[PDB]
Every structure is written in C-alpha cells, then in structure tokens.
Write a protein that holds these residues in place. Structure first.
Motif, PDB file in Angstrom:
ATOM      1  N   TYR B  19       0.802  -1.219   0.000  1.00  0.00           N
ATOM      2  CA  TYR B  19       0.000   0.000   0.000  1.00  0.00           C
ATOM      3  C   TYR B  19       0.835   1.269   0.000  1.00  0.00           C
ATOM      4  O   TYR B  19       0.471   2.240  -0.668  1.00  0.00           O
ATOM      5  N   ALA B  64      10.349  -0.355   5.304  1.00  0.00           N
ATOM      6  CA  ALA B  64      10.474   0.296   6.608  1.00  0.00           C
ATOM      7  C   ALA B  64      11.537  -0.398   7.464  1.00  0.00           C
ATOM      8  O   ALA B  64      11.247  -1.148   8.399  1.00  0.00           O
ATOM      9  N   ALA B  68      16.118   3.701   6.765  1.00  0.00           N
ATOM     10  CA  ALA B  68      15.227   4.639   6.094  1.00  0.00           C
ATOM     11  C   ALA B  68      15.008   5.923   6.882  1.00  0.00           C
ATOM     12  O   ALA B  68      14.407   6.862   6.348  1.00  0.00           O
ATOM     13  N   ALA B  93       4.948  19.067  11.473  1.00  0.00           N
ATOM     14  CA  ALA B  93       5.106  17.690  11.011  1.00  0.00           C
ATOM     15  C   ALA B  93       6.562  17.245  11.086  1.00  0.00           C
ATOM     16  O   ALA B  93       6.846  16.086  11.403  1.00  0.00           O
ATOM     17  N   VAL B  97       7.250  14.761  13.952  1.00  0.00           N
ATOM     18  CA  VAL B  97       7.599  13.473  13.361  1.00  0.00           C
ATOM     19  C   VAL B  97       9.079  13.155  13.509  1.00  0.00           C
ATOM     20  O   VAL B  97       9.462  11.979  13.447  1.00  0.00           O
ATOM     21  N   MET B 216       0.470  -8.424  19.849  1.00  0.00           N
ATOM     22  CA  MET B 216       0.345  -7.354  20.843  1.00  0.00           C
ATOM     23  C   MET B 216       1.196  -6.147  20.456  1.00  0.00           C
ATOM     24  O   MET B 216       1.250  -5.159  21.188  1.00  0.00           O
ATOM     25  N   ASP B 217       1.853  -6.245  19.300  1.00  0.00           N
ATOM     26  CA  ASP B 217       2.718  -5.191  18.766  1.00  0.00           C
ATOM     27  C   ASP B 217       3.821  -4.834  19.767  1.00  0.00           C
ATOM     28  O   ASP B 217       3.794  -3.805  20.444  1.00  0.00           O
ATOM     29  N   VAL B 267      22.219   0.213  20.687  1.00  0.00           N
ATOM     30  CA  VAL B 267      23.068  -0.901  21.096  1.00  0.00           C
ATOM     31  C   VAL B 267      22.279  -1.854  21.986  1.00  0.00           C
ATOM     32  O   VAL B 267      21.577  -2.744  21.493  1.00  0.00           O
ATOM     33  N   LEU B 894      28.207   9.286  11.429  1.00  0.00           N
ATOM     34  CA  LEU B 894      29.521   9.263  12.065  1.00  0.00           C
ATOM     35  C   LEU B 894      30.299  10.543  11.787  1.00  0.00           C
ATOM     36  O   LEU B 894      31.053  11.006  12.650  1.00  0.00           O
TER      37      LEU B 894
END
Lengths: 510, 1084
Positions: B19, B64, B68, B93, B97, B216-217, B267, B894
């Motif tokens: 999608y 994802a 990214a 946003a 975001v 349960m994500d 980490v 870095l």
C-alpha cells in the motif's frame, strides 16, 4: 602425545593440516587427558603458526583450535590467548563453528569464571556482527509513520486503509510466531546473557588498485576465460606498454602496427532494475544487462564475490568493461600483481617477459630490472611466492639480490630453493663479505655459512674481520648464547681458552 | 516486452499489503509527472540499481527498515521553512515526526527549543537529567491557566505530564496509582501492578494479561514485557504454573528481541531489560520453585542453592550493573525474599545489601530532589541503612568519627576560610581511631592546608597529619590517590629536610611506587630545588626494580632531551646509569640501543626523493647556468617511474631538438620548464638508513611497542615486540615540514604506524610541557558519570616525543586539518594556487587609485569586506565536501556526530588556559576519524591577609590573531550552535565544582615559573606566605566569573545559553571578528 606431537609437529598439507581436526576432536571428545605441554604448546603453536600466515586455513584453524584448546583443564594464558586468537579470527560463522564455539565459550567462560572475567571479557570484548549475524534457523513504524505522516498535504487521498491495514496486518501477522525448542533457549540465553556493552562509536567508514586488483585477480584466478583473459591481458599490456612507451619516430623498417582493433536504455534499465530489484539474480541480471546494454550500445562486489552461469557473464562483463573502460582512456602493479598470484604466473611472466624483452634499449632493461628488482625485492606466501617466482623466473646487483635472501630468511621449502638457487646461481669484497658473513651469523647459519664460505672460498683480508668480529662478538657477551657461541665459534689463546672454557665448564658442570 | 513506462510498468507490475509503495509511487509519480509537464529515471534506476530519487527509492524500497530514517528524515527535513508561506505543516510535522524514536539530541533540542514561541524551552531544553524539571511543571501549568494567545502545543502538555510522573516516579507512587482510575492505561497498570503485586490476586492479574495482549505489537514492548513479566511472575504454586507458564511462552517472547534487529537504537537498550528481566525472572522462578518445592525444615532445605546461588547470583547480579534499570530491576526483582522468608539470613543480607544500591547509585549518580527525596537491633539497621540536626539526629540514633568529622568539617568549612573551628576536631578526630578513608583526605588536606597555611611552629604539627596518609597505603589507589601528592606540598611548610624523614623514607620505601611511577609529569619538573634525595631512592629503586619498564621513557627522554647544569647531567646520568646498569644487567639495552639508533638514525638522509632532487638539480642548474652530453644526467637519475610524461617529453623533445637555434631554446625551455615544473616525497630507508633491518626488530627483542607501554594504561598485559614493516616510508602530503610517517606493523596484535613532524617547536622541549595540559583532560575521566557514556568518552591518542624536537604521533587514516583540507581541497580542481585572500585583497585593494584620496570612503570593510571576504568558499565547500563525502547513513551520522562532538569538545576543551586562538594551527583533525590531534609592578602584601591584592589591569596591546575562518563557522555544524550547546554547556558546566584534586599542583607547577627569563617570576614568586594569586586568581577568576551561576530562585541561571549566545554573538560578526579582541587578548 606421540600421535598429536608427531602428527602436529611433523608437518600434501590438506591431510596433515586437516587430520588434526577429526583426530584431535574425535580422539579428545571422549573426555580424557593429555594436555599441559601438548594442549598449551599445540594451541599456542597452532594459533601463532596458523595466524602468522594470514579459506580453509581460517575454517580449519578456527574450527579445530577450539576443540583442542577448549578441552584442557585450567583457564590461564592458554584460554585467553587461544580463545582470543581463535575467537578473534572467526566468530559466529561456518554454521557448525558458530553453534560449536558458543557452547564451549559460554560454558567454559561461565564455568571457569563462576578476576578472569574482567581481564578476559575486558581484554577480549569485541563488538561485531554477533547480534545480526546469528540467526541459525531462528524465525517498522518510523519510516511508515514518518513518511506517511510527514506529507498528507495538497488535497486528500484516503490515508486510512494503508495505516489501518498495515498496522493491523503487520501487528496481527507479526505478533504470532511458532517455535519447537531445538536450540532457542541455548542460543538466546547464551548469546543474550552477555550484558557488558560499551556504547557504540566506531566511526572510520570511508582507482588503479580496484581495476588492476579486480582485473588481475579475477582474470588470473579464472577456454573462454583463459582465451579472453590471456588475449585481453596480452593485448592490453602490449598495447598500453607499446602505446605508452613513446616510440615510432622515423624508422625505415616495418613491424610498427597492431595497436588497436576493438572499438532504449531507460526502458531496459528502469524495467530491469525495477523488475529485478522490486522482487543473487539482481547482480547477474543488473550487471549483465547494464554491462551488455551499456557496453554494446555505446560492481566490484559481484565480480569479486562471484569470481571466487554468473561467473562467465560477471567475469567477462567486469573484465571486458573494466579493461576496455580503463584502457580506452602502471606496468609494475599490473605485471607484479598479475604475475605474483600456477599457469598464469608462468604464462603471463614468460609471455610478458619474452614479448616485452624481445620486442625492444637501456630504458626497458634498466626500468624493467630496477622496477622488477625493487618492487619484487621490496615486498607469508606472497613474499616467498612473489620473490621466488619473480627472482627465479626473472633471473634466468649482488647486494640487492644477496641481501634479500639473508635478510628476509634471517629476519623471519621456499627458503632453501630460493636462497640456494639464487645464492648458488647468482655467483669491494671486504664490505660485502665482512658485512654479510659477520651479519649473517639452525639451518640458516650452516646453509649460509657453508654456501657463502664454500662459494666465496672456492670461487677465487678476512683476518681483521674474522678476528675483530669473532673477538668482539665472542668476547662482548639460553639458545642464543649456546647457538651463537657454539655455531659461531665451532667454525688468541686467552680469548679461546678463557672464552671457550665457560661453555664446556658451565655446560658440562650442570 | 519515459515516466509513463517506468511508473505504469513498475507501479502496475507489483500488483501481480503493498500500500505504501503503490500509494506513494502512484501519488508521487502522478503528481510529479502531471505537475512537471529526466533525472528521476537515471538517478532512481542508477542509484537504486547500483546498490530525491535515491532517498525515495532507497528510503522507501526497504519495507520500513532501520536505514530509512536517514533518507526519510533528511529528505523530508531538508527543506521546510523559508519557502513561500507554508510553515506550520512543515514545522509541526517535521518537529513532531522527527522529535521521537531514540536518536534525537540535536533534533529534540533544536526542534523543542527553536520552534514557534516555545514557552517550555527553558525547562524542557535545559532539563535532560531532570534537575530543573522540578519547577518546569509549574511554568507549564501557569502558561496553561493564562493562555490568552497561547500556541496550544498539546505535545508540550503531554511532556509536562510525563515529567510530573518521572518526578513522582517510584517514591511518589501513592497518587500515581490514582491514575489507574483514569489517566494511565499502561502507566497505572504497569507502575501499580509492577510496584507491588500480591498472592491471591487473580482478577487483578487476569485483566492486565488478558487486556494488555491483543496483537500485541511488541516494538513498543512495554505492554508485552509488562504483561508477560507480570503474568509469568508471582509464585502461585498452582502445580503446573511454572511448567505451563514457562513452557507456553517464556522463550517465545525472546523471539520479540529479534525485532530489535530491525531497529538497533541504541546498542543494548532493550537487551538489558529483556535479558535482565528474562534471566532474573527465570532464575528467580526456578530457584524459588525448586527451593519452595524441595521442602525445608524437613532437612533444613539442605544446601546447594544457598551459598553458591546466593553468592553468585547476588554478587554477579548486584555487581554487574551500569536510573530506571536499577530501580525497576532492583525493585521488581525483590519478590524472592517474600517467598523464601515467608515460608521459613538470606532475606536480611540480600534485601538489606541489595536494596541499598538504589540510594547510593541513584543519589551518587544523579548528582537535588533525588538525594533528598530518595532517602538495639533496629537502631543499627534503621540508623545505618539510610549543624545540630545532623550531629544530633545522626549521633542520637566508626560512623560517628567519619560522619561527625566529615559532616562538621565539610558542612562547616565553607563559610569561606577555616583557621580553627574544624582544626581541632579534624586533627584530633583524624589523628587517632584506626581505619579511615575520607577523614585522611578531607581532614588531612583541609587541616594540613588550613593549619599549614599560616607557616608557623604549630603548623609543623600538621606534618604529623601526613602520617595519617600511611593509613591510605592499603586502601587501593585511584585518581583520588593523586590528591595525596598535594600533601607533599605541606612539606614545603616544614623545616629543612627532617620532620617527615623517617615517616616519608620508611613509609615511601617500605611500600610500592603507586603514585611515584604512574604520575610522573610534574614529578619530572622538580629538579632545581632539594629534590635529589628523600623520595629519590624509593622512587628510583621502586620504579627501577618494581615497575619493570616504566622509567625508560622518562629517563631516556628526559635525560636525552636536555655550572650546575653541566654538572647535574653527569652526576644524575652517572648515578642513574650506574645504579640502573648495576641493578638490571644492562639496565635498558634494547631501549637505549633501539631508542638511540632509531632516534639518532635521522641524521643521515634526511633527504628527499627523485622528483625533488631531479627537479631542484635540473631546474637550479639549468635555470642558474642557462642565464646531448648534459641531457644524459637528468635522464639517468630521473628514471624512477615518476616522470610521465616528463621523461618522454623531455627526452624526446630535448634529444630530438638539439640543433638549430629557436628549437633548442624553445624546446629546452618549454620541455624543461613544463616537465620539470609539472612534476614538482618518497623515503627509502633500505638505501639510506638501513637500520630497521638488523633492527631486525633486533632479532625479536624483549621490548614493547612505542605508545602502548605505560604504568597505568594497558599495564601488565600482552607486551610483545613490534615487527615494523618495510622501508617504503611516504610523507604526509607536503606541508611546511617533512612529516615522516613510519609504519609499525605488529603481527602479535600491534598493526599500526608512526609519524614524525621533523625537528622544530615553539618553546623547544619546554613546549612539550604544554602537551601535559592535555593530560588535564584525563582528569575529566575521573568526573564523568554520564558524559563518558553519553558522549562516547573522548578523543585521545598516543604520541611518544623523541629527543627535544621529535614527536611520534599516531595516524590511523593519514592526517588532515582545516587549512590543509580546506586550502588543498578548495585550491584544486581548476587553476588555483594563491587566490581568495590574495586575489580578493589584491584586486579589491588595487582596483582603485592608490593614494587613496582621501579616506574616502571607500567603506570599510563593510561592502568591501563582504565582497573581498565572503566571496563563496564557505557553504559550497563545507556543504559540497561534507554532503558529497558521505555515501550512506554511517558516513553522515559518524561524520556529523564525530565532527560536532570533536569540534565542540575540542573547541570548548581547548579554548581555555590561554589557548583561545581563532586562527589555524591549533585544533587539527585527520580524515576518517577527525579529532583535533596533530607586567605592571610588584605591590606585594607581604603576609597576613591576602584577600585584597586584586590588581585588574585592562589594557589592549598587540594580541590580534583572530581572523581567517570563521567563514563556515555558523554553517559547518547544524544550525549554528544547536547541538553544541548541550554537550558544551553540560560538559563544561558539569565540572568546576567538585572532584578537583589536580589543580594547585598542575596549575602552580605548570604556571610557575614563567618561560623564559627567570628573573621577575623566580625572584618575585619566592615568598613565605600562602597563595601568590597568579594561578589562583586566574583560575578562580576565570572559572568563577565564567561559570556563574547554577541555581537561583525560579531556575534562572546564566548559561543556559549565555556562553553560546554571548560567545557566538560577540565572536561571530563583523566588528567583533575584524577588530580582534576575542578572549580579551588571550585573557591574558
């Protein structure tokens, strides 16, 4: 002791080098003894000898050093050195070595450590790809939420079915899994029980070496590959050397030609890249289609990782594209790198040496002899193979060729053939004879002293150099004293009686 | 089988989920293709097939992933404000975001402190640890109540709420449980259910487990970890409770940890909570179930799982630590005491010894409300488990001597001075008893300095306090032990050489070296006074016959680097060489022969190569003598495969054109000038030096490598020999000096290299003492509870200086600074060599009539400065070089984090102690890593009072040296000084308050006396009082005047952003940068 000491110390190398893994693992897997000097000397000598000559040596040495070094008793310097060298050379790889090294390392470290944990963990701690290169048959909202929520401007386009269907389908489909014991608690608990992180950091990151090393290694380490590699290397080397040698002035003779002969993308690149990337086939399809379409109509990971049906297209497309693109626009790096790495060395060295040496006059002999002698003598199998192959193949200048055998052989089967063939075939005298004879002083002393004394004494001022060097070296002073004094003195009554009475009296009185 | 075929075929070929790719590709392709009616197909197909178009294809075709965030955040945040008139959607946003996930720092500070009005930017941006967070809430509430033109910003409201909970975290759980009745779907159930469970609570535990598990994500593994830990924990003894709960899931939840592989930030993070919760819950459930199921009193529960399980689990779990992990793990993992103690010595020792780590770790690591709000058998445990109120309340309920002496002396010493008061209590209370730790340093240093500061007869009694230092002879060591060296300064207040002769000689000779070999530095500076004995026998005998290889670098470098001066080296070198040579064997034959031959082998060539010798000899001889016999000399010596096509063009043109008249001069001048000038290095040690060989590594000598051989760092480790390399040593590019970069290849685990900066220095060998100031940065390692773990420690290298002008620097990836990379990278490409300042100053200053008739203006600077100074060479070089030099997220993250942290830490840590230079030749860098490593009169007050001699002279003279770049100073980082204010203000303001130790010894010994001309400083600084200002006035005035303040009434303290705003606004402008006067003439 006799089988491990004789088989491990008596070393055609595949049977002797590979017999210790099955013999030491199968013979030592019955929970017995025979260690101390055998496991300590075998682990230290196997780790130093196996790590000093650095794919079968890493897998056999790393996979065989843990079975013979992890089955001892105590955990002193042999466990830290053997586990640090074997674990540092290869960690979590070769499938069997990953599941066989973590059980012995975690069980031996936890059982043996339950002051050694701080020095062994702090001195042997290494952050690599252990958490991401494990798997072994084991078994998201930032880009979707940030990319899908950062826009939503201009007009409107639902923007509900993608987040609801992606969140519900991804959470409901990803929230349920299945497993059946196997080795999940051992790999997860043993691989996740080490909680000793130290931040992350490690920045680092960051044209003739890639084309010369990739074309020479891929073309020389490969019929069509031999004919294309030999024709491309001979035509590129002869055309580049002849075209870059700056010749053809005003000669009246002939034989001055043969220099050159060889001379819709959006749909194929977009359809092939989108169709091949939107689904090992991407490197062969993209490299073969992009290289064939771009080379016919007008990268190092696929040729380097695949050259060791995709080998002919990857090697031919990479070698033809790199050789044509790099040569259509350096002889020591291509000739030494392409001839120093067995038919490619003799064919490339004999064809390049015979064609380059017979096709020509002091610039070719002086530049070829100085560049070949300095480049071949200035550089564990690369030094012996490159020096023995280049010196033995190019020798068919006594200080540069005599100093490398005694200096390289004394500063560290190829040493006897290379030193005996180069020293015996390569044959003001006070500096070279006094410096080489006085500085060259168990087989190196007898071979260099017998070969230099026999060749120098039989091929024809040594009293001052022998008396001053023997009196100063013998009077200026456990194996260095006995080997240097006995070997250097076994080949002036106060220096001989007083200087030689301590070796017989001290060595015989103990 | 151009945008219609790729968009229709690529968007329609994927439908034969999916999608975001179809909606983003169809909307972006339809909007861009329909609104733009060629670089997207070539950049997307070449950039996406070879590995705006690269960030969308690589950032959107990863399903994802973790990589990214750089392409989506960089592409979506690269252009927002300063465009047309839309800024609320891009700012809200982009800030909302981008101000989430885990990696923020500059994004949260800049987006939360430089967006719209931001009324909570002071407490929110200045919070961090939660210090000024106490009020923050008040401010927020106030604004809310007020309003009347507010910017809403709910996010702000929510932040305030979270802060509130944190403050009321743990301790203030009383009212927090009320949130479970309203606001708090996961906070009330997780905090109330995890902070206090029960025995027969089936309805309270079944609702949280049955209602907190629906998908349960777990990513977001708070509800899954809390529901799994709360549902799997609790000893209910339901037959198959541990078998069914431990066999149904338990290990399966560990599979959720694999999701962390899709998001490594940062980490550990979830590895410590998941591994500690799973290992602690499995070990506590298995040990509690086996011990609770194997009876007890009936056979007294035997043993086995008691001393080994309690000692190994309590020692490994309690000793293996790192805020929320100690309080959550220690408070949530304390459920084993109820099951083992309720069904009856391990509960009192385990609970009392394990429950005290949160108060000492949280109170000692969080340092105001944490230490004050987090804190006959019952009198010892109740009074020991936690001026008249401290002594009466702490003494009415040994600890009395340390608590009364440390609390009364530390709490009553400031005030300001001391004199008496704590002198009799500190000297009498510290001159007896038995074992003590803080009483000897606090009472010993305060009583010895305050009592010995009057310089009288009774002050000699303070020397007896030095005997208390012997009590610290068996209390380990540490950096704080270096503070004991300051007690040696009290000897300066003694008589001649007696006083502490038997105590100093017997105590210093009867123990080890400790601070007599690992410290050095300042100890190597005391030589003109009476330092030839006392600790010379114990330091030379212990350091030469106990520290192994430790005095070779200081003795060889100090003795080989530099009529009392001509006689001190013969007696010191003869006594040290005789005692050491007669002590070891051969004291240091490998170090003396290798250091003397390697350090002295640079006298003979000491040359160049073939291009410099052939170009200098041919150009100097031909150019100096011209104003085929002679052409054969340059061809025979210039034939080294480095003349292309200088040998072919010069040999063909000179050999082919050796007649006529114009062809010989034109061909010889053009071919010789173009060939000799177009090829104008290498270093061959085998044909010039020839010492490394038989330095065969000296036939594998028993010596360590140069740089990794110290008494404290990497001591008693794998000390092996270095095999070095070949002889092909190349120089570092080509600056003002021949940097001989050697190679030290070590097959035994020492594969590295070396460097050499020729033989030139400012203050000669004394200039090397300035490098000792860098050792002061190591003191930060002794006071970094959070900066060392949050700032990735600090940059440090190994530089072994040889002789009095040689330096052995460490180069991991070549070497590059600001002027070398900026001038070499900016002066390349086209025809450029001496432009910018020369072309702009010569063309702008010479374009008009030189007279100048008459002023004019001709202003000023001003437009002439902006046209002859700001002519590019700033944002294009830094943006094109920094943006084009990176190819992935590791190079950008870095390079940005290493450049911002190295530039802020190197500039803030190196811009002090009279070293604030705004020009070049200071903070250097490398390539792949970076870093930066390359009066009036007397008017004395005699004695008595010394708090009135504050002569502050303010006269500007010379100074200057404050120009050049600048340039890309406000654009080289990220929005000026956005991310540098947190690390610079937090790291610079976090110290200068406690844990001083090394201050008077390094400042007084390094600043006294002046170099050179020892006359006014040596003849005027030799008094008989306490402090002589100088280091105390400059350090106290600069540190106190520059670090003020830290607390106020409504949390309104300066810096904050006073140092960055005042320094950037007062140092990055036109009149401030052109009129010099940066750090007030270097302070001075």
């Amino acid at each position: 002791f006799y089988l491990i000491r004789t088989l491990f110390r008596s070393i055609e190398n595949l049977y002797k080098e590979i017999m210790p893994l099955l013999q030491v693992l199968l013979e030592s897997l019955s929970k017995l003894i025979h260690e101390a000097r055998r496991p300590q000397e075998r682990d230290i000598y196997v780790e130093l000898c196996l790590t000093v000559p650095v794919v079968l040596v890493p897998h056999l040495s790393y996979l065989m050093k843990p079975l013979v070094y992890a089955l001892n008793g105590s955990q002193e310097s042999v466990s830290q050195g053997l586990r640090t060298l074997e674990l540092c050379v290869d960690l979590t790889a070769e499938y069997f070595d990953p599941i066989i090294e973590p059980v012995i390392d975690d069980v031996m470290e936890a059982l043996s450590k339950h002051s050694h944990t701080t020095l062994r963990i702090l001195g042997k701690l290494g952050g690599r790809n252990r958490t991401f290169i494990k798997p072994v048959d084991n078994l998201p909202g930032l880009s979707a939420a940030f990319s899908l929520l950062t826009d939503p401007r201009p007009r409107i386009h639902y923007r509900i079915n993608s987040f609801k269907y992606i969140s519900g389908i991804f959470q409901l489909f990803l929230g349920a899994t299945q497993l059946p014991d196997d080795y999940a608690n051992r790999l997860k608990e043993s691989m996740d029980i080490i909680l000793e992180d130290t931040i992350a950091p490690d920045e680092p990151l960051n044209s003739q070496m890639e084309l010369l090393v990739k074309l020479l290694e891929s073309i020389f380490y490969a019929q069509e590959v031999r004919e294309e590699s030999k024709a491309l290397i001979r035509g590129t080397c002869n055309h580049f050397i002849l075209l870059y040698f700056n010749k053809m002035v005003i000669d009246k003779r002939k034989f001055v030609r043969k220099f050159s002969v060889d001379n819709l993308n959006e749909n194929c690149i977009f359809d092939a890249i989108i169709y091949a990337l939107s689904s090992s086939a991407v490197r062969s399809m993209g490299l073969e289609s992009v290289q064939l379409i771009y080379d016919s109509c007008v990268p190092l990971n696929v040729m380097c990782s695949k050259f060791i049906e995709e080998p002919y297209h990857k090697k031919l497309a990479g070698c033809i594209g790199l050789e044509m693109m790099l040569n259509s626009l350096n002889a020591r790096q291509l000739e030494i790198i392409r001839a120093l790495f067995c038919e490619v060395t003799n064919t490339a060295k004999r064809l390049i040496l015979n064609s380059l040496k017979e096709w020509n006059n002091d610039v070719f002999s002086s530049v070829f002899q100085n560049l070949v002698s300095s480049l071949i003598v200035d550089l564990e199998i690369v030094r012996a193979t490159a020096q023995e192959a280049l010196r033995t193949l190019s020798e068919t200048p006594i200080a540069t060729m005599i100093s490398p055998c005694k200096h390289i052989l004394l500063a560290p089967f190829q040493m006897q053939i290379g030193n005996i063939d180069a020293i015996t075939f390569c044959m003001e005298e006070l500096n070279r004879l006094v410096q080489e004879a006085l500085a060259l002083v168990s087989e190196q002393l007898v071979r260099l002293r017998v070969v230099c004394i026999q060749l120098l004494s039989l091929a024809i001022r040594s009293n001052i150099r022998v008396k001053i060097l023997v009196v100063f070296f013998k009077s200026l002073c456990e194996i260095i004293r006995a080997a240097h004094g006995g070997l250097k003195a076994v080949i002036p009554k106060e220096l001989l009686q007083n200087g030689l009475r301590p070796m017989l009296m001290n060595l015989s009185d103990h | 089988s151009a945008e219609t075929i790729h968009n229709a075929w690529v968007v329609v070929f994927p439908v034969a989920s999916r999608y975001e790719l179809e909606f983003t590709r169809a909307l972006v392709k339809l909007l861009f293709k329909d609104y733009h009616i060629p670089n997207v197909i070539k950049s997307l197909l070449d950039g996406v097939g070879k590995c705006p178009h690269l960030v969308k294809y690589l950032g959107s075709n990863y399903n994802a992933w973790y990589g990214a965030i750089k392409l989506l955040e960089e592409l979506s945040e690269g252009q927002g404000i300063d465009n047309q008139k839309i800024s609320d959607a891009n700012q809200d946003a982009l800030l909302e975001v981008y101000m989430s996930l885990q990696e923020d720092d500059m994004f949260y500070g800049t987006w939360r402190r430089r967006a719209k009005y931001f009324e909570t930017n002071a407490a929110l941006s200045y919070e961090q640890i939660g210090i000024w967070d106490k009020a923050l809430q008040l401010y927020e509430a106030a604004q809310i109540k007020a309003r009347s033109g507010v910017f809403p910003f709910g996010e702000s409201e929510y932040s305030l709420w979270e802060d509130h909970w944190i403050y009321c975290a743990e301790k203030l759980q009383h009212w927090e449980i009320l949130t479970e009745l309203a606001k708090h779907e996961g906070f009330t159930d997780l905090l109330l259910e995890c902070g206090w469970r029960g025995a027969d609570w089936i309805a309270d535990r079944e609702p949280l487990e049955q209602s907190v598990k629906t998908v349960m994500d777990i990513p977001t593994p708070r509800r899954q970890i809390f529901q799994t830990f709360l549902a799997l924990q609790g000893f209910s003894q339901q037959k198959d409770t541990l078998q069914d709960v431990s066999r149904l899931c338990d290990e399966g939840i560990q599979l959720t940890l694999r999701k962390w592989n899709a998001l490594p930030q940062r980490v550990t993070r979830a590895h410590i909570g998941l591994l500690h919760t799973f290992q602690q819950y499995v070990e506590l459930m298995e040990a509690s179930q086996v011990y609770s199921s194997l009876v007890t009193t009936n056979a007294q529960n035997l043993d086995v799982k008691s001393q080994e399980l309690k000692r190994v689990l309590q020692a490994w779990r309690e000793r293996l630590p790192n805020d929320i992990n100690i309080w959550n793990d220690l408070v949530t993992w304390r459920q084993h005491v109820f099951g083992v103690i309720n069904r009856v010595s391990y509960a009192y020792r385990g609970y009392h010894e394990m429950a005290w780590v949160i108060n000492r770790f949280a109170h000692v690591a969080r340092k105001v409300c944490i230490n004050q709000l987090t804190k006959a058998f019952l009198k010892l445990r109740e009074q020991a488990k936690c001026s008249e109120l401290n002594t009466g309340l702490d003494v009415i309920s040994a600890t009395q001597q340390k608590a009364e002496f440390f609390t009364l002396k530390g709490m009553f010493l400031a005030k300001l001075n001391a004199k008496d008061e704590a002198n009799q209590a500190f000297a009498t209370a510290v001159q007896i008893d038995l074992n003590l730790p803080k009483a000897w340093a606090e009472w010993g240093f305060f009583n010895d300095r305050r009592f010995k500061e009057n310089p009288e007869e009774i002050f000699h009694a303070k020397n007896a306090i030095s005997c208390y230092l012997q009590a610290a002879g068996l209390y380990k060591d540490g950096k704080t032990r270096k503070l004991l060296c300051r007690i040696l300064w009290l000897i300066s207040l003694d008589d001649a050489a007696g006083s502490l002769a038997k105590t100093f000689e017997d105590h210093h000779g009867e123990s080890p070296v400790w601070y007599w070999i690992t410290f050095v530095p300042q100890l190597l500076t005391s030589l003109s006074h009476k330092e030839a004995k006392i600790v010379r026998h114990i330091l030379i005998q212990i350091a030469k016959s106990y520290p192994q290889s430790l005095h070779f670098q200081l003795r060889t470098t100090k003795e080989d680097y530099q009529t009392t001066d001509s006689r001190q080296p013969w007696q010191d070198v003869e006594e040290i060489m005789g005692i050491l040579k007669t002590a070891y064997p051969l004291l240091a034959l490998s170090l003396e022969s290798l250091v003397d031959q390697l350090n002295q082998r640079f006298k003979c060539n000491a040359d160049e190569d073939a291009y410099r010798l052939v170009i200098v000899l041919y150009n100097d001889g031909v150019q100096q003598m011209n104003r085929p016999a002679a052409t054969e000399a340059s061809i025979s010596r210039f034939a080294d495969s480095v003349l292309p096509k200088n040998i072919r063009e010069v040999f063909e043109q000179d050999i082919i054109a050796c007649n006529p008249n114009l062809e010989t001069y034109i061909s010889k001048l053009r071919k010789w000038r173009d060939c000799l000038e177009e090829k104008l290095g290498k270093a061959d040690l085998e044909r010039v030096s020839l010492h490394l060989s038989l330095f065969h590594h000296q036939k594998f000598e028993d010596i360590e490598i140069p740089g990794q051989y110290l008494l404290h760092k990497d001591n008693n480790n794998h000390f092996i020999k270095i095999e070095r390399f070949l002889p092909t040593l190349d120089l570092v590019r080509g600056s003002n000096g021949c940097y001989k970069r050697m190679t030290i290849r070590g097959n035994d685990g020492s594969l590295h290299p070396f460097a050499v900066q020729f033989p030139a220095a400012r203050h000669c060998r004394r200039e090397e003492r300035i490098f000792q100031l860098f050792r002061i940065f190591d003191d930060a390692l002794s006071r970094k509870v959070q900066s060392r773990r949050r700032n990735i420690s600090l940059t440090l290298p190994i530089a072994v200086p040889l002789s009095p002008h040689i330096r052995i620097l460490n180069d991991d990836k070549r070497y590059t600074t600001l002027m070398g990379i900026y001038e070499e990278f900016c002066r390349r490409k086209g025809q450029s060599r001496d432009e910018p300042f020369a072309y702009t100053i010569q063309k702008l200053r010479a374009a008009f009539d030189p007279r100048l008739p008459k002023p004019d203006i001709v202003s000023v600077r001003a437009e002439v400065l902006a046209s002859i100074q700001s002519t590019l060479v700033p944002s294009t070089l830094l943006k094109d070089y920094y943006t084009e030099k990176f190819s992935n997220y590791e190079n950008y993250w870095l390079f940005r984090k290493q450049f911002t942290a190295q530039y802020a830490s190197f500039i803030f840590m190196t811009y002090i102690m009279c070293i604030n230079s705004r020009q070049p030749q200071k903070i250097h860098i490398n390539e792949g890593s970076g870093n930066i490593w390359t009066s009036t009169a007397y008017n004395n007050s005699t004695l008595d009072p010394a708090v009135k001699a504050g002569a502050p002279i303010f006269y500007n003279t010379e100074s200057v040296p404050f120009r050049l770049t600048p340039n890309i100073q406000k654009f080289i980082g990220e929005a000026g000084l956005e991310g540098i204010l947190s690390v610079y203000i937090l790291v610079i303001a976090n110290s200068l308050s406690d844990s001083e130790f090394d201050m008077e010894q390094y400042l007084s010994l390094f600043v006294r006396d002046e170099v050179i001309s020892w006359f006014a400083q040596q003849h005027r600084a030799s008094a008989q009082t306490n402090q002589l200002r100088e280091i105390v006035r400059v350090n106290v005035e600069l540190l106190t005047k520059r670090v003020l303040q830290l607390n106020h009434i409504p949390n309104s303290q300066n810096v904050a952003t006073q140092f960055v705003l005042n320094l950037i606004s007062q140092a990055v402008n036109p009149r401030n940068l052109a009129y010099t006067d940066s750090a007030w003439m270097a302070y001075l």
